[PDB]
Amino acid sequence: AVSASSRWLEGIRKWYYNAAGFNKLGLMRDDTIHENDDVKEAIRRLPENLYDDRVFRIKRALDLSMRQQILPKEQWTKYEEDKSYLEPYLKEVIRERKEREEWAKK
Amino acid sequence: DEDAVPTLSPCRFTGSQICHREDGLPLAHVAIAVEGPGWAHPDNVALQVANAIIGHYDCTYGGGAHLSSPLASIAATNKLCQSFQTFNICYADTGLLGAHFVCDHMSIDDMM
Amino acid sequence: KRSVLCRESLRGQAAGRPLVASVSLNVPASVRY
Amino acid sequence: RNWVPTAQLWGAVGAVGLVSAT
Amino acid sequence: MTNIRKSHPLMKIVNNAFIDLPAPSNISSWWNFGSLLGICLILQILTGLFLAMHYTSDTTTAFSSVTHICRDVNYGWIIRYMHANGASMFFICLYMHVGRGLYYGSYTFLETWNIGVILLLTVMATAFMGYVLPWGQMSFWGATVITNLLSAIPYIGTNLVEWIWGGFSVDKATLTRFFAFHFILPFIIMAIAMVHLLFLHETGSNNPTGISSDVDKIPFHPYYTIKDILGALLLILALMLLVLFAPDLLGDPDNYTPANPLNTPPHIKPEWYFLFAYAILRSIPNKLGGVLALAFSILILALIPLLHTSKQRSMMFRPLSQCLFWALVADLLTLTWIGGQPVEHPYITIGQLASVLYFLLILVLMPTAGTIENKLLKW
Amino acid sequence: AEPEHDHRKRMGLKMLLMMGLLLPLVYAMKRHKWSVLKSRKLAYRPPK
Amino acid sequence: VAPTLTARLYSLLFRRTSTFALTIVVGALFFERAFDQGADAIYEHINEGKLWKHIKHKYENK
Numbered sequence: 001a002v003s004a005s006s007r008w009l010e011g012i013r014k015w016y017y018n019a020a021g022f023n024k025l026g027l028m029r030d031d032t033i034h035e036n037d038d039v040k041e042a043i044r045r046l047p048e049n050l051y052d053d054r055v056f057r058i059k060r061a062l063d064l065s066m067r068q069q070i071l072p073k074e075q076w077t078k079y080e081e082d083k084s085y086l087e088p089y090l091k092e093v094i095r096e097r098k099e100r101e102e103w104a105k106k
Numbered sequence: 107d108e109d110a111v112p113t114l115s116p117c118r119f120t121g122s123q124i125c126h127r128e129d130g131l132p133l134a135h136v137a138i139a140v141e142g143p144g145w146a147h148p149d150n151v152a153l154q155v156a157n158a159i160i161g162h163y164d165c166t167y168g169g170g171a172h173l174s175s176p177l178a179s180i181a182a183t184n185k186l187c188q189s190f191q192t193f194n195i196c197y198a199d200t201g202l203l204g205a206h207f208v209c210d211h212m213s214i215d216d217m218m
Numbered sequence: 219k220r221s222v223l224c225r226e227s228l229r230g231q232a233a234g235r236p237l238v239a240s241v242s243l244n245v246p247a248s249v250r251y
Numbered sequence: 252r253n254w255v256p257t258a259q260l261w262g263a264v265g266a267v268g269l270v271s272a273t
Numbered sequence: 274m275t276n277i278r279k280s281h282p283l284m285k286i287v288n289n290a291f292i293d294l295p296a297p298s299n300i301s302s303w304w305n306f307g308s309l310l311g312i313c314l315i316l317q318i319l320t321g322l323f324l325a326m327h328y329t330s331d332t333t334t335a336f337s338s339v340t341h342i343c344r345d346v347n348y349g350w351i352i353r354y355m356h357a358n359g360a361s362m363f364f365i366c367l368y369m370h371v372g373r374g375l376y377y378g379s380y381t382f383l384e385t386w387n388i389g390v391i392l393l394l395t396v397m398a399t400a401f402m403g404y405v406l407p408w409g410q411m412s413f414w415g416a417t418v419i420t421n422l423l424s425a426i427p428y429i430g431t432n433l434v435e436w437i438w439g440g441f442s443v444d445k446a447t448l449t450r451f452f453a454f455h456f457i458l459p460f461i462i463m464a465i466a467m468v469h470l471l472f473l474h475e476t477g478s479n480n481p482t483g484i485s486s487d488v489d490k491i492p493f494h495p496y497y498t499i500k501d502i503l504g505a506l507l508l509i510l511a512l513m514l515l516v517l518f519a520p521d522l523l524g525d526p527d528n529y530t531p532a533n534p535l536n537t538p539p540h541i542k543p544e545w546y547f548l549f550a551y552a553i554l555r556s557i558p559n560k561l562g563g564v565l566a567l568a569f570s571i572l573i574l575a576l577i578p579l580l581h582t583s584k585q586r587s588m589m590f591r592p593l594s595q596c597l598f599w600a601l602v603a604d605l606l607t608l609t610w611i612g613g614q615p616v617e618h619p620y621i622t623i624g625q626l627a628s629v630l631y632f633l634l635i636l637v638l639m640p641t642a643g644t645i646e647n648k649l650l651k652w
Numbered sequence: 653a654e655p656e657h658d659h660r661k662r663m664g665l666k667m668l669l670m671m672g673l674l675l676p677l678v679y680a681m682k683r684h685k686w687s688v689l690k691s692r693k694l695a696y697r698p699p700k
Numbered sequence: 701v702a703p704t705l706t707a708r709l710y711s712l713l714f715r716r717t718s719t720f721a722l723t724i725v726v727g728a729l730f731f732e733r734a735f736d737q738g739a740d741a742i743y744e745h746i747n748e749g750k751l752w753k754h755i756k757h758k759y760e761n762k
């Protein structure tokens with residue numbers, strides 16, 4: 001029955017998004033996950049463009065964290081553009097795992 | 107003399123690097139050089155005799171390990187490189203002088 | 219490998235005495251015609 | 252070759268070092 | 274290979290761990306504490322051996338021997354003070370190392386962290402015994418109070434406490450034991466430190482961002498050797514500023530009074546490094562409940578890993594986490610304040626709430642905040 | 653109580669001056685080397 | 701033209717590390733002595749007549 005409440009989370013979400021500074025660093029959510037076993041496989045399934053692109057952005061952002069400088073206001077990731085490009089890839093990875101776990105009960 | 111304004115004005119010497127990574131390529135190309143003299147200079151034949159010593163080597167050189175240039179000998183013996191070559195790039199106002207080597211991704215540092 | 223896309227092609231083999239002459243030298247090495 | 256010269260400065264250094272240091 | 278010094282001797286290759294090791298580029302200045310942590314331990318050792326070279330481990334002499342060290346022995350005065358203040362620095366550093374594990378989630382290195390806790394508890398044993406060494410009023414009563422705390426254990430405790438002391442009080446036997454334990458502990462520690470290094474060398478360092486930096490690595494030698502050296506300069510500056518111009522400042526305990534086995538430590542307390550635990554301890558009425566919750570303050574650390582809730586091993590991009598992280602640090606500050614406080618109402622009620630806060634922050638608040646942040650990001 | 657009171661404070665003087673020469677020097681050394689990295693600039697050029 | 705003080709210093713003493721060390725050995729010596737002499741003086745100025753050095757006169761040789 002979410003019309004008021006779940007059309008307003010976008011506001012805390014939006015507030016939160018830019019609150020976490022990765023925003024500023026040129027980075028995108030997908031590029032911030034913890035690199036574990038599922039995430040790895042997922043990353044290994046990324047097409048060359050998608051994947052070279054994450055490499056550049058972490059290469060840009062770590063560059064910046066080294067120098068403690070934030071990117072220009074002009075050049076910052078905008079919440080409206082949430083490329084959850086890993087999500088697709090990540091999901092199955094997980095999906096395949098859970099199955100593999102489940103098939104292993106009896 | 108109003109022509110005298112050198113059209114051949116020195117070019118400023120800069121010790122930088124430009125690294126352009128492409129793990130999609132099989133071998134590695136490195137050109138390392140320090141700045142040298144122009145075309146005309148006593149030091150400039152002496153340099154050549156010094157590059158004579160280092161030499162220049164290829165996958166196909168018949169003498170590999172018995173080459174006399176210890177650089178050659180070492181890449182021959184230890185499969186350190188595919189092909190290397192010293193050069194002295196003579197220009198008016200400046201130069202480029204050093205080696206250039208091609209090798210595996212796991213060999214760059216020993217070659218250097 | 220060197221890209222062979224344009225008009226530039228001009229390789230075809232036929233010399234006087236020597237034909238398909240391959241050399242292996244102690245220093246240099248190659249393949250001519 | 253250049254070793255004598257260099258060994259000579261290296262010998263100097265150890266000397267003055269002891270002398271002073273010690 | 275030929276005549277590549279480093280790989281030639283096998284032993285010398287093992288040292289390239291400090292030169293040719295891939296080191297993250299981006300990297301707060303809170304990464305020098307590790308290296309400082311290790312200079313500390315060498316500093317103590319050195320200094321220590323020297324003190325041990327003129328110190329006597331007996332009830333009659335100990336205080337005298339200390340006192341002789343800082344009067345008739347040449348430069349025996351700085352060495353000793355340097356040694357005492359050293360141990361404040363070693364702890365100061367210690368807590369910086371951990372604060373960072375906590376914050377950037379370095380403890381994702383399951384195995385490396387574990388050894389860290391082991392290390393951390395192993396320095397604590399050493400600092401607890403050495404303080405006893407001089408045999409001052411403070412040392413004599415705190416050693417009694419703390420080891421007797423152990424007698425809270427129901428079936429054994431009592432027998433135990435007596436075996437530790439090697440008698441029914443803390444006379445010779447006890448004192449001689451601490452000396453020996455103090456001595457060898459740090460050598461045992463150094464093996465551990467090195468095993469610690471060993472496990473970390475398999476995965477590398479983490480960073481502010483909290484993302485892999487293999488795409489961005491840097492040779493340790495060129496950079497980080499300079500950084501470490503500079504950090505050591507800053508480290509040594511703090512130690513000497515404190516040693517040379519504020520000798521006991523930090524050493525709260527003024528008790529330079531040989532210990533008379535029947536007297537009154539108005540307000541007896543471990544040094545700064547242990548106040549948190551102390552506070553924690555008083556908050557419980559029952560003495561066994563206090564010991565367990567004294568043990569848990571410190572051991573809690575071994576579960577952090579299993580409390581991690583987010584998808585971002587880096588608190589850096591997570592604001593609610595940052596806020597509680599800091600709180601707990603200030604809570605922790607607050608707890609150290611209680612440590613020097615009289616036993617009374619005001620401090621009791623405060624300390625009580627601060628203990629609760631402290632386990633809440635580590636046990637329940639943070640973890641929730643983790644999920645919340647993850648939901649906000651739609652993760 | 654503290655015999656070493658005077659030596660100590662003289663030492664503090666020499667440790668402060670010295671450290672006022674080494675902290676600024678060694679910081680320099682640190683920027684000397686690092687400069688390579690901090691001055692560095694990137695460029696990304698896919699075939700794409 | 702002449703070499704900047706640095707360049708002079710450079711080509712005389714730093715090119716060869718053997719010379720560079722030597723330098724350092726000798727400067728470590730010279731520097732100790734001025735530092736101490738200066739630094740000591742400085743210190744002793746701040747506590748004029750406070751230190752025995754200043755006060756040995758009262759009970760010395762009559």
Ligand code: HEM
Pocket residue numbers: 314317318319321322324325326328339353356357360363396399400403404405406407455456457459460
């Ligand atoms: C490595 C961890 C160490 C820590 C945390 C540590 C800490 C301490 C502390 C806090 C004291 C009390 C001194 C005072 O406040 O009067 C002390 C004393 C002493 N320590 Fe250490 N120390 C360490 C290592 C060593 C080592 C390796 C040795 C010798 C091998 C050593 C030998 C001594 C001796 C003989 C004393 C007694 C004289 C004195 O009070 O200075 N310690 N230590």
Ligand code: HEM
Pocket residue numbers: 303304305306307308310311314367370371374379380382385386388389390391392393396462466469473477478479480574
């Ligand atoms: C004797 C005490 C210790 C010594 C000598 C020591 C030494 C070091 C050194 C040299 C480093 C590498 C540089 C750095 O990461 O800062 C390091 C990293 C680390 N230490 Fe320790 N440490 C000690 C105590 C601890 C403690 C008490 C913990 C946690 C309880 C700990 C956990 C870690 C972790 C998690 C890392 C790696 C984090 C990362 O760089 O990603 N260490 N330690």
